[PDB]
Amino acid sequence: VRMNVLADALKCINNAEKRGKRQVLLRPCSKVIIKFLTVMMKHGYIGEFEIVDDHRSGKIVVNLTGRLNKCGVISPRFDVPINDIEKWTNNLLPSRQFGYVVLTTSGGIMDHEEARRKHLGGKILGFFF
Amino acid sequence: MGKPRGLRTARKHVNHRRDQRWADKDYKKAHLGTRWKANPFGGASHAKGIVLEKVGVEAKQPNSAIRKCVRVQLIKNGKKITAFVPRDGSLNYIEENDEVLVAGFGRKGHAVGDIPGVRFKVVKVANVSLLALYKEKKERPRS
Amino acid sequence: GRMHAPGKGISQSALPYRRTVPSWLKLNADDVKEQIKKLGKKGLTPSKIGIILRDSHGVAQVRFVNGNKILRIMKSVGLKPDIPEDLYHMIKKAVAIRKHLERNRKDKDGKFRLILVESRIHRLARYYKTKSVLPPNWKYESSTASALVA
RNA sequence: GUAUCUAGGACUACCAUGGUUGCAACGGGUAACGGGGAAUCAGGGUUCGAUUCCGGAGAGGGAGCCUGAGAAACGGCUACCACAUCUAAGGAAGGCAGCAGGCGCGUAAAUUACCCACUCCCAGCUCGGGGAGGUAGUGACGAAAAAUAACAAUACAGGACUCAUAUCCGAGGCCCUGUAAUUGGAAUGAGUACACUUUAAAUCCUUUAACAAGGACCAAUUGGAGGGCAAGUCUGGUGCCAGCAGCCGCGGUAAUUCCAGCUCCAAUAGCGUAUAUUAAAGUUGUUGCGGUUAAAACGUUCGUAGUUGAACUUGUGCUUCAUACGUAUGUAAGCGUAUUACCGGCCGGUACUAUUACUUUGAACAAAUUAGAGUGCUUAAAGCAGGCUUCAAAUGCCUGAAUAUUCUGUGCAUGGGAUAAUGAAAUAAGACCUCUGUUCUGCUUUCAUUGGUUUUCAGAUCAAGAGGUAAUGAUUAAUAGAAGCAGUUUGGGGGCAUUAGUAUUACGACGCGAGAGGUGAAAUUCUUGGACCGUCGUAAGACUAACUUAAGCGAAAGCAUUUGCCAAAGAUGUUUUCAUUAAUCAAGAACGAAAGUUAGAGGUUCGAAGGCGAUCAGAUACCGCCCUAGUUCUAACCAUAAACGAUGCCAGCUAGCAAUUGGGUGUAGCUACUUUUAUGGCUCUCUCAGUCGCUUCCGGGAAACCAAAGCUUUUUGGGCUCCGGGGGAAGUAUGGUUGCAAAGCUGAAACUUAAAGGAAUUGACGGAAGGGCACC
RNA sequence: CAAAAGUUGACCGAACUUGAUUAUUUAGAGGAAGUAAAAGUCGUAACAAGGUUUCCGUAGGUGAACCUGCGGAAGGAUCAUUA
């Protein structure tokens, strides 16, 4: 059954990034997906994505750019306090310079470089670099 | 593939490892602990013994020599040992049926060289420290 | 993907987008409440009211022209079945293979099927108890099951 | 109820039948005192904690009990057991797991010293007491600091150097560098000891007058020199001996490993050896392993436990300022309003609130340890002291004795509402802020004191209206799932009935003749007039050819004559229904080729075993003949296979091209003739569900290869279950459990060992094909 | 008045005979395996078409490796055309 519905947009972006596609058709559009790509959109790792609506679940057609390498998804959502947030930024993020760990804190989905500013902690969602 | 990757499966993850460290061949001397069963001394480091013979253990192939070992009965438990005396000579320092401090043989349970299945090593015979006898750095007890 | 037999296919009915439409349909929400009562009094299931309201009359979808479903209409007019239709035909199948077998023994397939269709019963007799559509203390027995088809 | 200080099945009495567990009860093990903490790596971790602090227990064993506030006390008593002592024989007395000792045990642990001066305890007590505590001797467990020379010309050569001269070459050579039992200059403290100090006293250190080095002296060792792995192809000896050696290997008469000598290297008051442990070990793996072939996916599917489960339910706008710099935007408020009832001067204090998980900030909780800021103990490990114009008077205030983490974790407060579960309004609650009751339950104040009589009030709760404006209340129908359906079907799917087909054996007859069968060659074996052959005929049991496929169906095992029946099923078609019903699964359950077993039938061919005939050096084999159990059908048992795709299952993605089974669809195709037609066929086009091949990665892999064995990325994450940890021993031994039994499932270790294994290359134009030569 | 030795009975209950079970260690005629393994005897089973392709399940038999029967598989000596 379709277990993790965040996850296989990120294995359809990453899979279709590698072959170098320019547009990507996700299915079926969580509002955690759109909150995730908007985090990937403020940093320009993604185009402007359009949500072709059904009355079923939603479908997204995403425009790809070609700036990113890997969007993954940390299943299960491990509970990540602020103190062990640094543990993950060594692991998932390939340099201290760039890269992002998206996590759901309670004050809205933000990456670690916002939640380490707003002093929030939450559960982890995914990453990208 | 494989692991119970949920978030509420730390019961399966600990009961699996608990059941699968038995197949870690060297962590079955934490679990089954045969030290008091199969080791010639009951888990100690050294052992005082009393020499019974002078066994000329011949060398295994493809090396020919004769290793000149010694068959100890201990005093700790009444097990039996075939120990070993190194560094040529020093069977002349045995003065048979007089006590011996045998020791482990440095491969932690196996015979080492061309010696077939002999797992020990004399370190003191009549309390005079055999490494201080090839130089004869101390006097051998003779009378 | 076909939960008891390992073909993986897909077919279905596909609803179109516009839930509001048609506008030309001359049949209103009032008379279908009568016509479902007209057809459901002949003991048809909610499915076979739908496929004859669809072909002959013919309304596309009853949820669109009326703010209820076909089953939820039939409860509101006192036409409630004692056992719902999915558990019916899965019981009614399970009583045939339990009738073919008592004469034709030596058929391991119909033994294996009746395992596969009594297992679908006790998982859907189990969902119908949490949603309380059928009461608790309800174990489908394989003996008395013949009497609840006719 | 009794007992106790007290609750309490603590115990008695009656009465109830409860409690507990796959979320591991109960029993077993422990070389188990629990914690603080210790060891060790980057993290994650493993391992240890008898041991100074806290809590607990015990004083040879068990039991008992007095005094007391407090003891089930043992430097109290009472028995008994064990051990043991003095006994004049009647009796009496024993308890070092307090200190220092002694015996034992063992690889393994200090002196029968001094003192209450310290810390504190105790009594009647300022004083007494205190082998607590402190001092000392012992003490390479350990940790820190640091002595073995320093300097000088010649020296003896290297080298620059000035320069001759240059593939050479020397000298002015010289900052240098060494060698110099050459020469010195000797610089100092281990010694050394007056006297000091320290101390309860004494010692140790620190101060210290005197005393103290040409090495021979005040004199470093311990391991090694094949590789790993730092450092001799040095000499002699020994010649598969002695030995070395963790591993791989040296020695078999020129040893880079042995015994040495010279040398040399590594650390150095330290070094080797053993067992243990940790890191190396992504070889226990949550981060983070592996399972096609190296070890490793259950034979199959069903399925509770468990784990894991799609989407959707207040979000940016609009205006301003604080605010980065025309702009920006990160700001608060106004405004699509419970931005919340009140009184206060936008402001206090109040009236007043669906949870949980997670998260923020707090509280709470011993130090020691650890992390650590402060501090020149001569430095350092430590310690918690210590600074200071005071220079000539000290009055000279304080720094301090922080701060967070192992006191993890639970638990308790508070901020948030993303994520995540639960929760409402469908056999009935949509409400009314409510004058409210058309219930009545009342309940205390004034009737100075107090009530019989009843109203206000009704603090109230529950009936309660038809004080019913009510948008009145039911999310989408997942390319999730189950269900339905002129459906149209399709298929060696399943069961039973029905029958067919040649053939094989047998038997009959008819005819013809003597050889027939079999092999590499025979023989066993069959047959005179009739085998084999021919022929027609009868009986039988078995098997379903050809069609036959990279074709189908099935959960796997498996599944082929016709037909009738019988329930079943995938796929497609579906503006049908239901609305998460799902995924995967320990235990459990059904099915399971062949062989085998129990009973009943049948019994053609084949045929384990058996007997022959050969073959062979032998042949209990291959080949040849005879056949028996078996093969076959119903009734059960067995529960395995190279049960293989050596590839668990559900989901998504990432590319062509060719076929190809079903079903759908368009011919802007042919063709059939029933007719130009229409049903049927074919071709073309598209689409599901696929399956099989190739082509390639422009993905992976050790490769062979794989469109999954890919997206397992750089320390990776879609769920879920089963399984592997060098090779043997060994699927053995033993226990449990199933079977009529064969056997099946569970299932070790002692011991042994350094390789065993995977894939691929190059060696046989060495007993394999296809070539091509010559009179060794 | 108080009170000893004695004493009745309940209780706590050492201890010792028994009966049992548990956990351990051990002796044993005989028997049957494993490993050492190097040099013995007999055969030649496997690796080449290892001279009967090899293996698997089961069943019987044989001095021994092994052989035979029924059903699998290729890890084969065939990825197969050849109308």
Curated annotation (Swiss-Prot), chain A:
Key word Nucleotide-binding present: no
Entry annotated with the keyword Ribosomal protein: yes
GO terms for cellular component: cytosolic ribosome; cytosolic small ribosomal subunit
Extent of the signal sequence: none
Entry keyword set: Ribonucleoprotein, Ribosomal protein
Highest taxon in the source lineage: Eukaryota
Transmembrane segments: none
Gene3D superfamilies, per database record: 3.30.1370.30, 3.30.1490.10
PANTHER family attached to this UniProt entry: 40S RIBOSOMAL PROTEIN S15A (PTHR11758)
Protein name according to UniProt: Small ribosomal subunit protein uS8A
UniProtKB/Swiss-Prot annotation, chain B:
Subunit and partners: Component of the 40S small ribosomal subunit.
Cellular component terms (Gene Ontology): cytosol; cytosolic ribosome; cytosolic small ribosomal subunit; ribosome; rough endoplasmic reticulum
Entry keyword annotation includes Ribosomal protein: yes
Region listing for Disordered, in residue ranges: 1-23
Biased composition range(s): Basic residues: 1-19
Pfam family, any one: Ribosom_S12_S23
NCBIfam families found in the cross-reference section: uS12_E_A
Residues with 3-hydroxyproline modification: P62
One Gene Ontology term from the biological process aspect of the record: translation
Modification after translation (UniProt): Hydroxylation at Pro-62 affects translation termination efficiency.
Keyword Secreted: no
Domain of life: Eukaryota
Family: Belongs to the universal ribosomal protein uS12 family.
Protein name (database record): Small ribosomal subunit protein uS12
Alphabetical UniProt keywords: Cytoplasm, Endoplasmic reticulum, Hydroxylation, Ribonucleoprotein, Ribosomal protein
From Swiss-Prot, chain C:
Primary location group: cytoplasm
Gene Ontology MF annotations: small ribosomal subunit rRNA binding; structural constituent of ribosome
SUPFAM superfamilies the record matches: S15/NS1 RNA-binding domain
InterPro entries: Ribosomal_uS15 (IPR000589), Ribosomal_uS15_arc_euk (IPR023029), Ribosomal_uS15_N (IPR012606), uS15_NS1_RNA-bd_sf (IPR009068)
Gene3D superfamilies in the record: 4.10.860.130, S15/NS1, RNA-binding
UniProt key word Cytoplasm: yes
Cell compartments where the protein resides: Cytoplasm; Nucleus, Nucleolus
GO cellular component, one term: small-subunit processome
UniProt function note: Component of the small ribosomal subunit. The ribosome is a large ribonucleoprotein complex responsible for the synthesis of proteins in the cell. Part of the small subunit (SSU) processome, first precursor of the small eukaryotic ribosomal subunit. During the assembly of the SSU processome in the nucleolus, many ribosome biogenesis factors, an RNA chaperone and ribosomal proteins associate with the nascent pre-rRNA and work in concert to generate RNA folding, modifications, rearrangements and cleavage as well as targeted degradation of pre-ribosomal RNA by the RNA exosome.
Protein name: Small ribosomal subunit protein uS15
